[PDB]
Structure 1
Amino acid sequence: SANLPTVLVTGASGRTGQIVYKKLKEGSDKFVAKGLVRSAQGKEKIGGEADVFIGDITDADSINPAFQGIDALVILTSAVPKMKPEFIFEDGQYPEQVDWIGQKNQIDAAKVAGVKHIVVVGSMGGTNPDHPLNKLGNGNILVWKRKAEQYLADSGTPYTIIRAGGLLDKEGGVRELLVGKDDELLQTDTKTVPRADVAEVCIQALLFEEAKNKAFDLGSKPEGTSTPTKDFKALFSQVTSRF
């Protein structure tokens, strides 16, 4: 409902996705949490609870049930490279299918259900088509994720696109978070961010109107070189880019 949003997080058994899922449950006062995962193993990993759905984002009908009644969507799905030390994408699970098409299906499902807000987590690197990450498993992962991002900006639904720096497994809430445009943070040594702060930014974007129709790159300052971001109003306000 307008005042108690049902928020679906997809890739909810993912590393960032599961922090988003728990934070929607921990604070299941301001939100009703709902998770989408790819397998029964993923669903059990996260508590196996009733608000978790199983589906394949490359099969639009298999994910449609999860979208019923939702108010917001946080997309935390990604094509994931597999190792045979050389990396490859499983068949029909390339960034084209998973990140472009897989996300297209979420976005289309969400418009149907009348979602007020879709948040998507992506990656820095998308202003440069020759970026090293695109070579990984011959995928063009950043190209396809950008396509999904542009498709989301295009759809008419209020959106927040979060292009994270290198993901860290470090404590959330303890860093100054930095917000950039067009990969500019990649010139710095502040171009990486804990998974738990990306998760926090997804949830915060839900709470502030200043986050709607914004696209930014997300980095952080090392813990101890500044005061932790506590004021997300100010943070979102410094963004002016729509893409």
Structure 2
Amino acid sequence: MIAITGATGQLGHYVIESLMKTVPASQIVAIVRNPAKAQALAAQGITVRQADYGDEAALTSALQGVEKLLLISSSEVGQRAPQHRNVINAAKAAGVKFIAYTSLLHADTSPLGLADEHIETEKMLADSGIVYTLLRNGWYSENYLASAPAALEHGVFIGAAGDGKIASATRADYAAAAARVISEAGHEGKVYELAGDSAWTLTQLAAELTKQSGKQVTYQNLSEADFAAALKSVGLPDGLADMLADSDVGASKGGLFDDSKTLSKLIGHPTTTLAESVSHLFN
């Protein structure tokens, strides 16, 4: 029996659809905090167990019978470690035999500040005494593409990534990889550096963006301080602008680049290209 946290999130939703191609709904257990948002999962045969992430006891009850657990990291970036602390201890007590975790590409060496909470979580895993696998996801192409409209309307794309190379991949790609790891054998104890088969600069993004839209789009490389202040300028939560600007700087440092091709070789086919993703904007 396999269990999965964050099943109601964008990545998890895909993990589940992916898993359901080869796994009977019943053999899947979605540990969610709010079953109200688990409408779809219920309408598929998937088991849903409620568990407050800040509640180890509830997490332990929720992990009963679970042989393999996918810990889709928490989106509550800021108090994530304590949450994953609870989850890992619940698993130990419940007797989970295998845990796969979504971390960050090259976590231990990444220049991005987002690596922090993941590193703490990777340590706890090392400490758990439970066999585990690190699914170090690189950047979701859908992140930058979230600013596709703003760049199309206002004419240009901005950031602080310089010439850094982002080997992005879709959420569906990473979810498939997570799906294989938790369902198929031969993927325990591994440290997978998952990323796109290709990489691209923010400028290649603008050029690709103008090539398909027709309208012009230039890339304006700003400094970190600039970029940050730039987001809040159009009214953006400080935390966000900060993290966002830090990540771009982490990318300018090559922290989002990897060319191991672990992702495609793992999902058994080529990862989704930026060209195809960009295409969706005009689906």
TM-score above 0.5: yes
User: Cα deviation per residue 1:167-197 (whole Å; 9 max; x = unaligned)?
Assistant: 1359xxxxxxxxxxxxxxxx97352121112
Cα offset for 1:73?
A: 0.2
Cα offset for 1:20?
A: 1.5
Which ranges of structure 1 fall in alignment gaps of 5 or more residues? Answer: 1-5, 81-93, 135-140, 171-186, 234-243
Question: 1:44-63 alignment to 2 at 5 Å?
Answer: 44=39, 46-47=41-42, 51-63=47-59
* Corresponding position of 1:162: 135
| Alignment partner of 1:212 is 2:185 | no
- Look up the equivalent residue of 2:75 and give its one-letter code: A
Question: 1:137-148 alignment to 2 at 5 Å?
Answer: 141-148=114-121
User: 1:70 and 1:147 mapped to 2: Cα distance?
Assistant: 24
User: 1:125 and 1:201 mapped to 2: Cα distance?
Assistant: 16
When the two structures are superposed, what TM-score results if normalisation uses the length of structure 2? Answer: 0.57
Structure 1 or 2, whichever has the larger Rg, is 2
Aligned residues of 1:43 and 1:54 also touching (Cα < 8 A) = no
DSSP-derived class of the 2:165 partner: coil
- Look up the equivalent residue of 1:77 and give its one-letter code: S
Cα offset for 1:42?
A: 2.1
* Corresponding position of 2:84: 103
The counterpart of 1:197, out of the listed 151, 173, 183, is 173
Whose strand proportion is higher, 1 or 2?
1
User: Cα deviation per residue 1:135-181 (whole Å; 9 max; x = unaligned)?
Assistant: xxxxxx431221111110222211111111111359xxxxxxxxxxx
User: 2:264 and 2:111 mapped to 1: Cα distance?
Assistant: 33
Which ranges of structure 2 fall in alignment gaps of 5 or more residues? Answer: 144-162, 200-260, 269-283
* Corresponding position of 1:41: 36
User: 2:68 and 2:92 mapped to 1: Cα distance?
Assistant: 10
Aligned residues of 2:168 and 2:198 also touching (Cα < 8 A) = no
Cα offset for 1:127?
A: 3.3
Question: 1:1-243 alignment to 2 at 5 Å?
Answer: 6-29=1-24, 32-44=27-39, 46-47=41-42, 51-80=47-76, 95=78, 97=79, 99-124=80-105, 126-128=107-109, 131=112, 134=113, 141-169=114-142, 189=165, 191-206=167-182, 207-209=184-186, 211-222=187-198, 229=264
When the two structures are superposed, what TM-score results if normalisation uses the length of structure 1? Answer: 0.65
Aligned residues of 1:165 and 1:193 also touching (Cα < 8 A) = yes
Change (3 A) 1:155 1:167: same
Cα offset for 1:65?
A: 2.2
Moved more, 37-46 or 10-19: 37-46
Cα offset for 1:66?
A: 1.4
Q: Percent identity?
A: 24
